[PDB]
From a paper:
The ADAT2/ADAT3-Δloop mutant complex could easily be produced and purified using the same experimental procedure developed for the wild-type (WT) complex, including the ion exchange chromatography step to remove the bound nucleic acids, and further crystallized. Two crystal forms were obtained, diffracting up to 2.1 and 3.0 Å, respectively. Crystals of ADAT2/ADAT3 that diffracted up to 3.0 Å resolution were obtained using a crystallization condition containing 0.1 M HEPES pH 7.0, 7% PEG 8000 and 8% ethylene glycol. Structure determination was made by collecting MAD data on ADAT zinc ions on the crystal form diffracting to 3.0 Å resolution. The combined MAD and model phases were then used to build the ADAT3 N-terminal domain. Surprisingly, the ADAT3-N domain is positioned differently in both structures with respect to the catalytic domain. Specifically, while the very N-terminus of ADAT3 interacts similarly with ADAT3-C in both structures, we observe a rotation of the ADAT3-N domains by around 90° with respect to each other. This rotation is only due to the movement of residues 34–39, the rest of ADAT3-N superposing very well, and possibly of residues 152–160 that are not seen in the electron density. Inspection of the location of the positively charged surfaces of ADAT3-N with respect to the tRNA revealed that these surfaces are completely opposite to the tRNA in the low resolution ADAT structure.
Numbering used by the authors:
A (entry chain A): 11 to 176
B (entry chain B): 25 to 151, 162 to 237, 270 to 349
Amino acid sequence: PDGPCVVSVQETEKWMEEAMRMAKEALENIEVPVGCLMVYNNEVVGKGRNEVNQTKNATRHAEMVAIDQVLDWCHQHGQSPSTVFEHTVLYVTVEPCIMCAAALRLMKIPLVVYGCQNERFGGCGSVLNIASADLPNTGRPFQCIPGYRAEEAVELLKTFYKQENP
Amino acid sequence: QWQALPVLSEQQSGAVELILAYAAPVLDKRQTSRLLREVSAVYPLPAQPHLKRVRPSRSAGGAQSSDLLLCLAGPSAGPRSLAELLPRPAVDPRGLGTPFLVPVPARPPLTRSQFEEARAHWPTSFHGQLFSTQERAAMQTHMERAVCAAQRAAAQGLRAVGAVVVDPASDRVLATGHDCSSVASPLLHAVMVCIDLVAQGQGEDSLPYVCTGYDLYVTREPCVMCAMALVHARIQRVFYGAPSPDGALGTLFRVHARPDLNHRFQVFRGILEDQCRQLDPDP
Ligand SMILES: [Zn+2]
Ligand SMILES: [Zn+2]
């Protein structure tokens, strides 16, 4: 078993309650309400919410922001990215899209805790299962812990699309 | 001397679809050699080279006639006379009868299972050409530009993968980029770099779907991360040289041709392929 994964998994309630707070942050900022944390050894290493409309760029999903924050946190502390990502647990409101699933594979993340399903674009099962897929040249497959506080997380999407065009 | 071959949906790739065409019977079978010359010159049917142009008939009894494949049918497929369809004196039509409509298969059959299925509506051969020959030079100098960029990358010690983003309205190069993946920054594939270039070059009021309308030329086929990015960004067309082993626009996925994503776009493969075969693959 990974040592920094089991330690990070323990305060899962704590990391989600902040992951949710970040989705409420993105909601009231007219963003798709997804927020995530990346925990390396019971310490937040990158955070991130959806920044799509803000940057006028659509690749800036929450998960892709955080990956950049953790590559920074690697660079300031001069640690190689391989030895940090491979022991990092990602906490995200919503099953990662088909794109972010591929990034996490390439970063060799090992584990993801998500809330509610992702019917529109989900790459963890819903549309394609990129996470467990056999992609020999696209990083390392990773496993998922679905469902954590999904009801709260989905009532955030429902109240984003009946609000985008009534 | 390269061809650009569309990559179509999982479903749409294995079916035989038909289009309406006008044929006409040959009554004077000795004008056949002649009428073939005179007609397939006016209407050469470039989009459809798989279609033998004379269909033999047999009568229960053994009466051998033929019908000549004339031309494609207009959007209002009513009956059309010989004079309407065959201009003179390009075509001395004598020897032909009144023209009828006939379903003929729209695309060259790829498997033998489609071939026997197409043949049943109109004869066809086994074992097309899509663009103008000035647009074929448009894509020429753009793929070249992406190979020129790909090689720059390998020379420095980077994934030999290059990409340009062209606005087809003006054939203006909007972004040139190659893979920039480093140990500190592993997600800078050529395609991801080109998007972030595009996005920073746009005014205050701009949609976040930063690729709408634009073309993309990549040396080899995008990975999953890249391909989906082009979906979220709403690219219009994508031309690549050779496939990639984990490619998401042909090889292991076709994310451009799905109902489930909010967006769908054309993918062509083979542009300047012989060059790109030796470039590196995404990722
Ligand atoms: Zn995503
Ligand atoms: Zn890629």
